[PDB]
Amino acid sequence: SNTLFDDIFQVSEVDPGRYNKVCRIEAASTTQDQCKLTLDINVELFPVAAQDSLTVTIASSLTRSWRPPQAGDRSLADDYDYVMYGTAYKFEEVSKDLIAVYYSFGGLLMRLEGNYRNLNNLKQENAYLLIRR
């Protein structure tokens, strides 16, 4: 129930892929070169352009009947601009030095490749991804 990954990613290129509502954006971390992330984003709700810096975080705290907030007093990790829910379904090793994790946010594909420091990610259904512009 705490943040596991947090980074700043600059988008190298955006490919609509024939989908007007959804697009695919590939970005690289501004701190670690080996860290890369290619994610499907619903540009209609969260428009994204090339050469844009986005703060991407992964949290495990927002069966499990979903409920509306039903009140403005309720607060959580909502200090972002685009929050999605997905499930990890694949972990692979590249060059015996990098780890790539695959997430499926309701049919939106994401692949995040990084160093061994990304071991916090686990093959669990509970996985929230938040992006701040």
């Binding site: 009947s65 409920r67 509306p68 039903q70 009140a71």
Partner: protein
């Protein structure tokens, strides 16, 4: 040769209740209300009004078959809130909105000479 009774669509049959409320075991504080001899007209409006209420959690209306004039509304609210009270509040709000709309339409028609 055996077409359905057209009047029976909107007329209650012998020994038939207009509303049938039963509990739902799928989720806590969930109820199923079967409306007889009713169409999408009332079900959709009631469900839309219910969804506009913060306390109401789930409100879904289903028509089993076009042949039978009947539908089922599944309503689930928060703990300590009786679904029947939520339905009554939604119906009262619908009545108030309809009355306000009627008054506005009457005033507009009276204002216009034509």
């Amino acid at each position: 040769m055996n077409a359905p009774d057209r009047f029976e669509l909107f007329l209650l049959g012998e020994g038939e209740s207009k509303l049938k409320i039963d509990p739902d075991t799928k989720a806590p504080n969930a109820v199923v209300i079967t409306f007889e001899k009713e169409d999408h007209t009332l079900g959709n409006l009631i469900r839309a009004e219910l969804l506009n209420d913060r306390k109401v959690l789930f409100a879904a209306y289903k028509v089993e078959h076009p042949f039978f004039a009947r539908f089922k509304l599944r309503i689930q609210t928060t703990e300590g809130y009786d679904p029947k009270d939520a339905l009554k509040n939604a119906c009262n709000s619908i009545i108030n909105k309809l009355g306000a709309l009627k008054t506005n339409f009457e005033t507009e028609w009276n204002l216009q000479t034509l």
